[PDB]
């Protein structure tokens, strides 16, 4: 359904900016800029998905080695503007916040089969 950027236990963003979700996306929905932050750790400055050209193939979830972006089973998020349907880094971190209890249930049953 909609997209979510998960977090580690004890709160760390999980997206190491490896650009693999961008390179595989068959409809070019992902756009990322990445910079080395103050810690010297590799993180994304900008993460972004256009949900008007996403096609829900799940390659972005299959490709990530850290398993940072996933697909939550929410389909009930229909909007009234296009601007609302463009998801930056902050909307997706809030989704991966909100659905984390549920994504536990999804990846407890999926992760052997992946």
């Amino acid at each position: 359904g909609e997209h979510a950027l998960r977090r580690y236990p004890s709160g760390e963003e999980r997206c190491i900016a490896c650009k693999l979700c961008e390179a595989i996306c068959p409809a070019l929905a992902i756009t990322i800029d990445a910079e080395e932050r103050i810690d010297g750790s590799r993180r994304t400055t900008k993460y972004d998905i256009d949900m008007t050209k996403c096609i829900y193939c799940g390659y972005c979830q299959e490709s990530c080695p850290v398993d940072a972006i996933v697909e939550t089973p929410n389909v009930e998020y229909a909007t009234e503007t296009r601007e609302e349907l463009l998801y930056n880094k902050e909307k997706l971190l809030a989704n991966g916040d909100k659905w984390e209890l549920e994504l536990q249930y999804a990846l407890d049953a999926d992760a052997p089969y992946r």
Binding site: A27, T52, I55, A78, R82
Partner: protein, 140 residues
């Protein structure tokens, strides 16, 4: 009255049209909501662009939208119908029906789940709760 009777024109043309025929199916019924496909735009309240929009159909999509009587809405079903979609960088495609028709509810999903299309319908009916056609004339 505008909610409990709710008549779309069955414009759906591609992948997302079968997913609309699952809203006509006996598991997720639309008759139980008041929804029926009057298949002529002269009688439909609303339109559903459910599928792609090529450059050969953009005047046809507008001529179907031009005809419907004046309390009219439109919901955009699918990801090919808002912002091009899977075919965004193609020579013969319109990058969403936002360019052609003024759309009120966007339903996202490439096959946007019959759950999610019905949720877009409930969102449009909520927009019909606060239309305020008679309070507006009092100039609120």
């Amino acid at each position: 009255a505008r909610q409990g009777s709710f008549w779309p024109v069955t414009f759906g043309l591609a992948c997302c049209a079968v997913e609309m025929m699952h809203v006509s199916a006996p598991r997720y019924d639309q008759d139980r909501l008041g929804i029926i496909f009057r298949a002529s735009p002269r009688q439909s309240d609303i339109m559903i662009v459910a599928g792609t929009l090529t450059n050969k159909m953009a005047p046809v999509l507008r001529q179907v939208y031009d005809q419907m009587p004046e309390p009219r809405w439109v919901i955009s079903m699918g990801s090919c119908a808002n912002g091009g979609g899977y075919y965004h960088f193609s020579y013969s495609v319109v990058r969403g029906c936002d360019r052609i028709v003024p759309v009120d509810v966007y339903v996202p999903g490439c096959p946007p789940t019959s759950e999610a299309l019905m949720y877009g319908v409930f969102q449009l009916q909520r927009k019909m709760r606060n239309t305020k056609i008679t309070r507006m004339w009092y100039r609120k």
